[PDB]
Amino acid sequence: FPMKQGVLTHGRVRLLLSKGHSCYRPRRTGERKRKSVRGCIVDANLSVLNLVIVKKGEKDIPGLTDTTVPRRLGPKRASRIRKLFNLSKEDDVRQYVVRKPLNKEGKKPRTKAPKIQR
Amino acid sequence: GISRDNWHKRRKTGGKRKPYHKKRKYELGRPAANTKIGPRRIHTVRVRGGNKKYRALRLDVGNFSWGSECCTRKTRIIDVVYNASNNELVRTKTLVKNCIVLIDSTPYRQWYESHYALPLGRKKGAKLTPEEEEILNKKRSKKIQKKYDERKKNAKISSLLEEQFQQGKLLACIASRPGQCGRADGYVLEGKELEFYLRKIKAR
RNA sequence: UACCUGGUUGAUCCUGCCAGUAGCAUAUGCUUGUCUCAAAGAUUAAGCCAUGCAUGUCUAAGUACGCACGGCCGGUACAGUGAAACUGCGAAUGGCUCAUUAAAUCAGUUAUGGUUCCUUUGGUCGCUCGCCACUUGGAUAACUGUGGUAAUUCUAGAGCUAAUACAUGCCGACGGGCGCUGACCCCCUUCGCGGGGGGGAUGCGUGCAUUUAUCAGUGGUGACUCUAGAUAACCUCGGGCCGAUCGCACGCCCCCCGUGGCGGCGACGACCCAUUCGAACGUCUGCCCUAUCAACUUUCGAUGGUAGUCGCCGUGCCUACCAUGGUGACCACGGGUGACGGGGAAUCAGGGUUCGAUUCCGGAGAGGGAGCCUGAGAAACGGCUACCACAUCCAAGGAAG
RNA sequence: GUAAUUGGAAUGAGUCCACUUUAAAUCCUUCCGCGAGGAUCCAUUGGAGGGCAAGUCUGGUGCCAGCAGCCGCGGUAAUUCC
Numbered sequence: 001f002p003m004k005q006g007v008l009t010h011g012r013v014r015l016l017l018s019k020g021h022s023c024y025r026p027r028r029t030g031e032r033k034r035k036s037v038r039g040c041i042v043d044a045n046l047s048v049l050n051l052v053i054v055k056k057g058e059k060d061i062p063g064l065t066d067t068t069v070p071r072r073l074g075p076k077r078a079s080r081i082r083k084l085f086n087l088s089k090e091d092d093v094r095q096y097v098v099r100k101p102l103n104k105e106g107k108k109p110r111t112k113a114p115k116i117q118r
Numbered sequence: 119g120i121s122r123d124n125w126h127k128r129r130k131t132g133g134k135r136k137p138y139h140k141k142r143k144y145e146l147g148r149p150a151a152n153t154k155i156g157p158r159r160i161h162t163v164r165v166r167g168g169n170k171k172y173r174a175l176r177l178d179v180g181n182f183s184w185g186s187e188c189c190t191r192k193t194r195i196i197d198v199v200y201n202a203s204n205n206e207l208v209r210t211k212t213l214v215k216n217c218i219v220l221i222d223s224t225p226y227r228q229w230y231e232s233h234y235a236l237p238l239g240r241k242k243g244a245k246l247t248p249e250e251e252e253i254l255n256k257k258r259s260k261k262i263q264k265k266y267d268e269r270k271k272n273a274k275i276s277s278l279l280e281e282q283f284q285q286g287k288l289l290a291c292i293a294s295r296p297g298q299c300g301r302a303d304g305y306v307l308e309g310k311e312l313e314f315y316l317r318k319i320k321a322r
Numbered sequence: 323u324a325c326c327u328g329g330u331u332g333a334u335c336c337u338g339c340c341a342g343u344a345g346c347a348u349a350u351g352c353u354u355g356u357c358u359c360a361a362a363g364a365u366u367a368a369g370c371c372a373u374g375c376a377u378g379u380c381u382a383a384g385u386a387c388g389c390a391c392g393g394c395c396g397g398u399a400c401a402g403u404g405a406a407a408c409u410g411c412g413a414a415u416g417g418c419u420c421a422u423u424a425a426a427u428c429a430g431u432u433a434u435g436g437u438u439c440c441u442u443u444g445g446u447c448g449c450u451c452g453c454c455a456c457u458u459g460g461a462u463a464a465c466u467g468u469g470g471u472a473a474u475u476c477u478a479g480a481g482c483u484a485a486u487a488c489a490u491g492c493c494g495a496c497g498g499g500c501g502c503u504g505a506c507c508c509c510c511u512u513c514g515c516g517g518g519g520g521g522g523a524u525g526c527g528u529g530c531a532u533u534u535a536u537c538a539g540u541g542g543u544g545a546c547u548c549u550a551g552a553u554a555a556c557c558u559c560g561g562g563c564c565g566a567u568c569g570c571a572c573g574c575c576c577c578c579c580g581u582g583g584c585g586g587c588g589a590c591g592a593c594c595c596a597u598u599c600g601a602a603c604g605u606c607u608g609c610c611c612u613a614u615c616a617a618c619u620u621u622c623g624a625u626g627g628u629a630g631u632c633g634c635c636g637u638g639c640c641u642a643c644c645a646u647g648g649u650g651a652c653c654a655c656g657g658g659u660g661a662c663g664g665g666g667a668a669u670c671a672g673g674g675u676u677c678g679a680u681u682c683c684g685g686a687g688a689g690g691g692a693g694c695c696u697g698a699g700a701a702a703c704g705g706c707u708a709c710c711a712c713a714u715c716c717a718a719g720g721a722a723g
Numbered sequence: 724g725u726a727a728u729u730g731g732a733a734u735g736a737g738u739c740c741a742c743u744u745u746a747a748a749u750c751c752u753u754c755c756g757c758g759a760g761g762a763u764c765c766a767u768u769g770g771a772g773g774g775c776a777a778g779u780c781u782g783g784u785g786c787c788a789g790c791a792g793c794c795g796c797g798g799u800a801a802u803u804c805c
Contacts, residue, residue, distance in 0.1 A: 032707075033706065048479095050478070110389080119694075136422090146633070201629090301532090
């Protein structure tokens, strides 16, 4: 039973979870099911926990701080291609779009483009 | 979910009735708003059909009405002095649809100085020269004097009503239903209606 | 077919009831070759139920970036298909049963001389004077990867990305116009005068709708606090509208010039207004047995008057102050009902007696009672939460009914 | 009407294609074929005193067993019992 931001009862309480909090895929509209959750204080009774670096230290942690994995689904709206590529004005948003290459063995080599929005 | 239906009432001959169905959603429950005076917070409720009645939790201002000269302006709300149904709801400061509520004078002051140009609220003199004597004179022509010296005849106010302009606050009556609509509007007491409440307030 | 026959006696005539007779209808007994219609776990136990199920859903027209498929037929926006996911809309209908409930349910009835009600249809949707508008904003799922307990339609973490999801907000229209305020016209009686106009600089308020107050009585009704018009104001930050939407055939004028101004068909939309399917509340009238049920209701709203509270709205539906009322032998009130009501059914000289859980319409409830969110509509139960009664898994840490 | 002898442009149940119906099939409808002599390919349920149509025919029982909705029959010849 996972943790939740701000409960802090270092144990297991039961919450009435509606649509949009966490821990509950609300199986139809407006439903509020009562589900147990774990308080946000960390204890010794956890099988696993998640933990995220925010300032880089010393060494090549193998498989952790090397191998920058690309965000291969690039920006698609015409304000997020207008957010990283500095394509200012009259630069024809189509012409410097991202494209996504594909490499199946049996089929032909192809690249592949999105739609566009706005 | 307190319904307001009728199968829980004893019928006319004095014999109880047995219910045959549950209490339905089209007699939705009734939590009273009990609108009090402070800064403005308004809460919304969906009803049948999909309308959103604004309900009034805490109010400051209203849009009260002069009446005899048709001057409808805003005013902040000062105090609650008298209520028709229960004597308990004045001492918890609750704005309802028929509580005699107490507003200020300065929109009605400054309009009467604007439409007729008469001194009002200023009772002695000799403190009102630089910004406060420039309300009546304003460089009128001969013909603007012609159409504002004839406005001394339609300028009169009932005796008890300029008297509280000199003493500060108008006692009004709410006419809207706060907690159902979300405003505390109303008219201003004057006439024999004002003598009715002023009898029933002082005598307490 | 408005119909009778045997029985108290040693025989008679009666009063009587028993029995026969014929329907119809649940059940059963024995028998059963043909064919076509065809009722069928309602009578007790509205008792509990194994499992398998009974509601989900795309068109060229909301969002493709799964190589999941397709000739990429060409130097890059999408050749089209398409699992999923976001979004919408259904699931409030149908079906099942009769435990309740005896004025409740139910049925009737109400020329230019100036250049309350999603959807449906049918309107309204440049009517408002007001420094991105050739397109303004952040996040989220599918997916990639990393996980956790035995498990549940359980889901955590990291990074991506869209909108008809959630936002934010304006050119245009649009020049002005309307009402008030308020420097300018002396030509009128300016005679020391008293005057009377047209027009003005300025500064406001300006539509639909929400809320309050005032004046007059365009179209309406035995009838209006109707609709509408004139005024002075408001405009809820969990906030009203003024389309930052998607397809289809494309064509026109290209004269600033190969860049721009126009156009038709739509699909979605959109507070309002009517409209239909409705719903809820009501008016009068109508029900079975019971006096071994004659007084009931009023502390706990009982019956009326003001004023208010919420309520979609009318009202003791509440609250608060008052008044002392209301019902009854024309049977109130209480009890029973092996009572769901109605269309109707069996039977019939006329008159009736009984049945109706049952496919049509109306009511109710999904083990018992309560509480709710979402939605337009649910106090839904093939939605949830709690309790009480019943029961299931378990690695006994917890899960599901 | 027995007891008959035959029969033959007589046939249905039954077994059998095939078409048809149907969403797919089934009946059924049509249609080769086979298919009746104690046509063994066979009809029962209740009664036979009176009400109430139908028997004092036989054997057994002996107020026993039992019948009978009512009246009644039952005690060594029963129109009612098996």
